[PDB]
């Protein structure tokens, strides 16, 4: 599975979750930022790894990094 | 220039083929 790791630049502006078309990322209340939010990636078994998150990640350099890991049925995104 | 040495050649590289499959099925 594509290991998505969300670092501590994540200021919780939720363009990652609103940008991800797979709901692998949610928002978690985390009292370390101004907004109190920091994203999480629990369901990385559904993670395609299209890196549409890292497009819309307005941190300094990429709080959310998508490491291309294993390739299962769902992570390959094949229709059949 | 003869024929028997060709048979001896394919014998020796047939044995060398047995060392090729012999090395091949261990790594």
């Amino acid at each position: 599975a594509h290991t998505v790791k969300i670092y501590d630049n994540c200021i919780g502006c939720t363009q990652c979750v609103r940008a991800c078309p797979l709901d692998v990322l949610e928002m978690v209340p985390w009292d370390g930022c101004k907004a109190g939010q920091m994203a999480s990636a629990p369901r990385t078994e559904d993670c395609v790894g299209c890196k549409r998150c890292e497009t819309a990640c307005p941190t300094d350099f990429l709080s959310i990094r998508v490491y291309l890991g294993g390739e299962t049925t769902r992570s390959m995104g094949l229709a059949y | 220039i003869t024929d028997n040495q060709v048979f001896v050649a394919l014998i020796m590289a047939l044995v060398c083929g047995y060392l090729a499959v012999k090395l091949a099925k261990q790594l």
Partner: protein
């Protein structure tokens, strides 16, 4: 197919017979009361969730992940909450202590079964 692969069954309800667009392609009839939709893969289904939600109110919707042993799962919604909206029930996994700036060099991960960010 349905004999060996996971068919994703998006179920949702509406108020009026509108017309949405399939991820297969082409328009669909959109039964007004309540309707299911068997799909292939999850990006099609949540792409339909964005297809409906960015148009108008379509909520109380989620795919039951039909996997071929028979049972279902609950994708999208998961917690009666919208995923970018914050619920105080989601336990975070997938973080490290700092930025990339403290990730170890892969010559320290070399000949070990670790990752370059684990610390």
């Amino acid at each position: 197919c349905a004999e060996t692969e996971e068919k994703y069954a998006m179920t949702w309800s509406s108020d009026q017979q509108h017309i949405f667009e399939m991820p297969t392609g082409g328009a669909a009839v959109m039964n007004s009361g309540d309707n299911l939709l068997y799909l292939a893969r999850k990006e099609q289904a949540l792409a339909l969730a964005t297809q409906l939600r960015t148009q108008f109110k379509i909520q109380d919707y989620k795919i039951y992940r039909i996997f071929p042993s028979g049972e279902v799962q609950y994708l999208h919604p998961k917690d009666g909450v919208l995923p970018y909206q914050v619920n105080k029930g989601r336990e975070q996994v997938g973080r490290v202590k700092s930025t990339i700036g403290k990730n170890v060099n892969p010559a320290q991960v070399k000949f070990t079964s670790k990752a370059t960010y684990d610390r």
